Write a protein that binds this DNA or RNA. Structure first.
Ligand SMILES: [Cl-]
Ligand SMILES: [Cl-]
Ligand SMILES: [Cl-]
Ligand SMILES: [Cl-]
Ligand SMILES: [Cl-]
Ligand SMILES: [Mn+2]
Ligand SMILES: [Mn+2]
Ligand SMILES: [Mn+2]
Ligand SMILES: [Mn+2]
Lengths: 98, 83, 109, 94, 94, 105, 87, 99
DNA sequence: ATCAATATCCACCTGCAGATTCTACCAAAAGTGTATTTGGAAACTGCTCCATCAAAAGGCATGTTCAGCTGAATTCAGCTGAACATGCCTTTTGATGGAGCAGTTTCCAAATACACTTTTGGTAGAATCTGCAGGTGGATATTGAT
DNA sequence: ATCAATATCCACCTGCAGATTCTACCAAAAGTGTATTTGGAAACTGCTCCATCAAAAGGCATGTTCAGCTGAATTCAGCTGAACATGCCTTTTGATGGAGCAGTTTCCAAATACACTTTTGGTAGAATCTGCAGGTGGATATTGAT
């Protein structure tokens, strides 16, 4: 059998998705998730098709951008692996949490 | 025996294929849960502000403008949906 | 009897000076709107439209595609440094990120 | 009935800066949101300018200071320019 | 000449909750800024609500959804409370 | 003559608050409940930070609220933290806080 | 008819001990030697950007004195809203 | 025969001293000159309300201090205990200030 | 770095539906014309509030010495997470039917806008009070050395 | 574990600045009566948006193996902290001349308020096009063995 050593598809994968522009969470898992989060605020809500992609767009953006910002924090600590410890530092500096 | 909140419908590979668009070589196993947490907070308070817009307008359908006004409200101004 | 020249072309603009005026009156921005304000602004909006439009089209043809997608407009705005701040806390739908990998992540030889 | 947009003006100015370049519909979408935002910021910042100084009206003079505050660097000045340039050309409406 | 403040009202409300506590002039200052800031945000957020809904007036309802939007959690909730019927006490007299 | 502010059982000047809605040009028109409801919210809020602050005034063994105390108030109370996160209180100080790892041990 | 004296290089008046003092209040136990210049680096950008806006407010208003309001209006504009000076 | 304290120990001692106070930490006349200089270099021939300088100095010290803790979190994140430029740059980059 | 070998990319070509652009008419803006109203620019000018200035002092910065403890560097085991084939399933996709609602005309009652006229609450200096900052010296605690 | 060396706490004092109180003149609510729009409340559609519905597609979970990474542990050079002596410069205070707000008044230049006349900006069909969606086949990269 022969193959690629750990980390290398990752780069191959990073360049692929940075190359693309497509949505990455899937639509109906999201939609389901969205309406659920919605119903819990006001019952009897329905949604514009457009208003859901609006939310996927905002989220995927937020999240991806959530880091480049920590990957910097993982790298800041002579590491190459992102850990929860890292995300929290990202959000704490941004001002999301303390 | 798959009874599981749709937050977990945010499938694992898919949770972060994103991380790569985000420029990440490799990710901890804990990261996914922690992530699913942040995903949900982010869109919770957004839908909360979006919805009061839907509600102030005495409507029962959330429109993309409600989303947009709300994203802006949160300082996450989104272009391509009406403002 | 002397008839119509749009005020937008009296100012040599593509952007609608008249409309912008209507829009400033109806924005609750102040009690009165001077007649120069909407021309000046329309110019500024037309100018700014122009500036991201050329920088984007450049990146559009660079991508070997005939027209402009949101992709290109992103590549345009994020690669340009002066537009990056004007649009820093703004998110472009269907845009993507600029390709960027940290030095430390790459293979070695 | 139908709403109104900036797409013709954007498409026009587009044909002028790149005669051989169209524009995608959602790219037109973005461009539309862009004008709008910028519109508000300027209009807002001027509105608030006008108000600090207890002046009742917004002049081109306020719109300018607005641009000065809110547009960055050199992009600020081609902006003050193309604006005072559009405005004198207007007042020469003979 | 004629500068006006909210400082009497703060002093009033100060003797209500801490009858034997007083307030320094620089602390009183800060309280004003607090009042004034809180004032535009609410008044502003109301302003664009009316505007999103194409209606020309700000009613108490706008001031409210405003409060709902901009105050966090429980002081948002004690506000609408303490607030919604500052207004009937007003409309139940004539 | 009876003023609207006490007519609604408020300390804050409903009358003025109405007038101050005159110049934001917040809209063409101002409903008569708007200044009442709002002036109430302001009175509510000044009140709320005033108690939490006075507490810290009296923890500190002082009769008079310094901006300091107002800071200790705003930052230690967490819902008030958030409404005032992006605001700086002049002459305020920080909350006393040392990082765990920094302490000798 | 009395103009003086040239103001030049006043950034170094932000002394290392003072940079220290700010840093302790920030809760910092130990500081690299490079930190001080970097800091002066960051301070001066910050203070430029604010004073640039403060002043644009002063001139639009056709005054030749920067007033605290101008400062405040400018700080707020930066999203660093300051309480205790007039708004 | 004579000594007092070990390294690091007064450091904490002053952290507690300054976190307890509210005084401005930059000196007044040095700050003012700098201010006047940046100003003058921006538009000549300006004057300043005593009031508007403190406005700036209050605002500044607030800004800088707030970054320092953000910095300190970054130093402690990297198993270090001393702040370095490497830290401040990370702080401002995440803040989004654009270093 | 090269040799040989899976394994992945990347231009070169290409014909088509799904979009983009172009054409062909209609209310709704925008533009005019004539009529009034007003906000704020010029022109004094009263009066703060700024800019220097000086003297003396003592707080605080600077520069130097000395060592401790921090940052960084190497080594290394072990355990975590990447890589993949594998196999089953949730998601996609393509219309579709029908109720559900947003979008609007039309039409008045209620709510708010003007314009004055009293009437009163808020403000600005002057009149009294009186917290608390700063200076103590006495105690307790903390720190660091034997 | 004791003992010296500071430093931190903390209670009491006390004259002063900064707070609190008290009086008197004016801008600002409030009160009336008449003058104008609005935001529904009822009556009606178009259009999206929900609920199903059903074939297949790849996508996801799962389990296995190994690599390399992260976390730990040690050693060490050197950097940064603590202490001091030295001495500059900020801080204080108090005075003073003047630039420059800001407070008033006066009078255009400019904006708004209506009334009609044109013109354009935007729709829904009708007429053109290009990335794509996909099939190659030629190179670049990657990997394990020499
Ligand atoms: Cl219709
Ligand atoms: Cl009174
Ligand atoms: Cl004494
Ligand atoms: Cl006094
Ligand atoms: Cl293709
Ligand atoms: Mn004008
Ligand atoms: Mn009566
Ligand atoms: Mn200079
Ligand atoms: Mn080839």
């Amino acid at each position: 059998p022969h193959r690629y050593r750990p980390g290398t598809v990752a780069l191959r994968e990073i360049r692929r998705y940075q190359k693309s522009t497509e949505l990455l969470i899937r639509k109906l898992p999201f939609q389901r998730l969205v309406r659920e989060i919605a119903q819990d605020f006001k019952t009897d809500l329905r949604f514009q098709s457009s208003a859901v992609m609006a939310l996927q767009e905002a989220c995927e953006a937020y999240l991806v951008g959530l880091f480049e910002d920590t990957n910097l924090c993982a790298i800041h600590a002579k590491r190459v692996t992102i850990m929860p410890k890292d995300i929290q530092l990202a959000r704490r500096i941004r001002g999301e949490r303390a | 025996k798959v009874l599981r909140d749709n937050i977990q419908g945010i499938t694992k590979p898919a949770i972060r294929r994103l991380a790569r668009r985000g420029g990440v070589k490799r990710i901890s196993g804990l990261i996914y849960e922690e992530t699913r947490g942040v995903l949900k907070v982010f869109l919770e308070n957004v839908i909360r502000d979006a919805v009061t817009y839907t509600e102030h307008a005495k409507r029962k359908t959330v429109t993309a403008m409600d989303v947009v006004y709300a994203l802006k409200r949160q300082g996450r101004t989104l272009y391509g949906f009406g403002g | 009897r002397a008839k119509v020249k749009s005020r937008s072309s009296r100012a040599g603009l593509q952007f609608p000076v008249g409309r912008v005026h209507r829009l400033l009156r109806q924005g609750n921005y102040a009690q009165r709107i001077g007649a120069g304000a909407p021309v000046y602004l329309a110019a500024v909006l037309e100018y700014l439209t122009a500036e991201v439009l050329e920088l984007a089209g450049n990146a559009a043809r660079d991508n070997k595609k005939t027209r402009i997608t949101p992709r290109h407009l992103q590549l345009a705005i994020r690669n340009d440094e002066e537009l990056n701040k004007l649009l820093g806390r703004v998110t472009i739908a269907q845009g993507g990120v600029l390709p960027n990998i940290q030095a430390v992540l790459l293979p070695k030889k | 009935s139908r709403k109104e947009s900036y797409s013709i003006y954007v498409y026009k100015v587009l044909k002028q800066v790149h005669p051989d370049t169209g524009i995608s519909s959602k790219a037109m979408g973005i461009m539309n949101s862009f004008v709008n935002d910028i519109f508000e910021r300027i209009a807002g910042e001027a509105s608030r300018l006008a108000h600090y100084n207890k002046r009742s009206t917004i002049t081109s003079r306020e719109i300018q200071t607005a641009v000065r505050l809110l547009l960055p660097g050199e992009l600020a000045k081609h902006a003050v320019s193309e604006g005072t340039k559009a405005v004198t050309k207007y007042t020469s409406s003979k």
